[PDB]
Amino acid sequence: NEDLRLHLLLNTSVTCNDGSPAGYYLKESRGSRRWLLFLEGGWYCFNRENCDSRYDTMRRLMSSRDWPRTRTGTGILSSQPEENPYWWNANMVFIPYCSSDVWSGASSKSEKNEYAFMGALIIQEVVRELLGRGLSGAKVLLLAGSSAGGTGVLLNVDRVAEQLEKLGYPAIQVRGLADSGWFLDNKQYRCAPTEAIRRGIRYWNGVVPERCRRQFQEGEEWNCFFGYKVYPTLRSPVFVVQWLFDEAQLTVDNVHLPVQEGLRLYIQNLGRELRHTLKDVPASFAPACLSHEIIIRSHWTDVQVKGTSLPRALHCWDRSLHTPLKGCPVHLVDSCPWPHCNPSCPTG
Ligand SMILES: O=c1[nH]nc(-c2ccc(Cl)c(C(F)(F)F)c2)o1
Numbered sequence: 001n002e003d004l005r006l007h008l009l010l011n012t013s014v015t016c017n018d019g020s021p022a023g024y025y026l027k028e029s030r031g032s033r034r035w036l037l038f039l040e041g042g043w044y045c046f047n048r049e050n051c052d053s054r055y056d057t058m059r060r061l062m063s064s065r066d067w068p069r070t071r072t073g074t075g076i077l078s079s080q081p082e083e084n085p086y087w088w089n090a091n092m093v094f095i096p097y098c099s100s101d102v103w104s105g106a107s108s109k110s111e112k113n114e115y116a117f118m119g120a121l122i123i124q125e126v127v128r129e130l131l132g133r134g135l136s137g138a139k140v141l142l143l144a145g146s147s148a149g150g151t152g153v154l155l156n157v158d159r160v161a162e163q164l165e166k167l168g169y170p171a172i173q174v175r176g177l178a179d180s181g182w183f184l185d186n187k188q189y190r191c192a193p194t195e196a197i198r199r200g201i202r203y204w205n206g207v208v209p210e211r212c213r214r215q216f217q218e219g220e221e222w223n224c225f226f227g228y229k230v231y232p233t234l235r236s237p238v239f240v241v242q243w244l245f246d247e248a249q250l251t252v253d254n255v256h257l258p259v260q261e262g263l264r265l266y267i268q269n270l271g272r273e274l275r276h277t278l279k280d281v282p283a284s285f286a287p288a289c290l291s292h293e294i295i296i297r298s299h300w301t302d303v304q305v306k307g308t309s310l311p312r313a314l315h316c317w318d319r320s321l322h323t324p325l326k327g328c329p330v331h332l333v334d335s336c337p338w339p340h341c342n343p344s345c346p347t348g
Pocket residue numbers: 041042043044102146147148149151181183184193194197225226248249252
């Protein structure tokens with residue numbers, strides 16, 4: 001099944017990096033007032049030189065010219081209840097990541113700019129075009145995303161909520177699901193995300209949520225790309241999915257996997273730090289695994305924390321947003337200290 005169909009944005013001034021129109025893939029569900037808008041991930045680029053390289057060998061992530069007419073919805077984007085126990089009947093939207101700006105950019109290609117970085121405007125334009133295609137009737141809009149798209153959820157969920165309020169749709173409940181986008185600005189074990197993001201925000205004209213921007217102020221907006229710093233400033237409900245030993249986190253930390261004491265302590269400390277940042281995140285799913293992304297993989301149902309799968313936790317979250325619920329938990333953070341100490345971790 002290739003059940004999500006491409007729509008290029010009617011406002012062709014909202015573009016991918018190379019000026020081609022951005023777009024979205026849509027699979028409507030007439031019987032449903034639930035809308036899932038998923039933000040693709042795929043790292044970023046932050047200067048002319050590294051964006052040029054990405055354009056050579058990651059061009060679907062900077063351009064729509066080669067996109068296919070359809071995509072198959074998988075995992076949380078699947079319409080089969082066997083694969084997606086959580087929201088199989090929802091209206092499904094996959095928003096391709098073609099702005100290389102962690103979904104933060106608001107800059108057009110111009111005399112001054114070789115590339116457009118319009119991630120934040122792509123999201124707003126998708127939302128506004130979908131209102132004419134049924135989203136106006138929605139009860140819940142779940143903005144989800146993986147990796148850079150998960151960070152994009154944190155950066156954009158409150159803006160989507162404000163956009164819908166200002167457009168006259170205050171009944172649509174906007175919520176966020178951030179998968180594998182909750183990173184730590186920690187010491188490396190041996191370019192670095194904080195500096196690259198600082199440079200990126202400038203290169204992209206990047207924007208961050210207002211309350212977080214007001215806390216950190218000019219020149220320090222890079223702080224708002226880090227979940228534990230931006231999450232407390234957000235008003236929309238956000239469910240956080242994060243492997244405790246995320247492969248992308250380890251990569252930026254210069255860890256490449258007998259492990260000797262120094263690295264053992266480094267890895268154990270990373271897990272404990274991640275766990276600590278989630279202590280006050282009531283809706284979260286954080287298994288003790290070495291992996292990356294979870295929600296659009298076809299076998300996303302297999303992992304469990306304390307005996308509860310992610311589709312179940314998300315269903316429990318839905319119920320909680322109608323006192324904790326008997327046997328239907330929403331805060332699921334592993335406490336064991338080493339990758340794969342949870343037997344349900346992905347096998348690779
Ligand atoms: O697609 C991917 N894989 N790994 C990332 C990633 C890793 C670390 C950091 Cl700090 C960030 C952020 F938060 F600013 F973008 C993103 O993004």
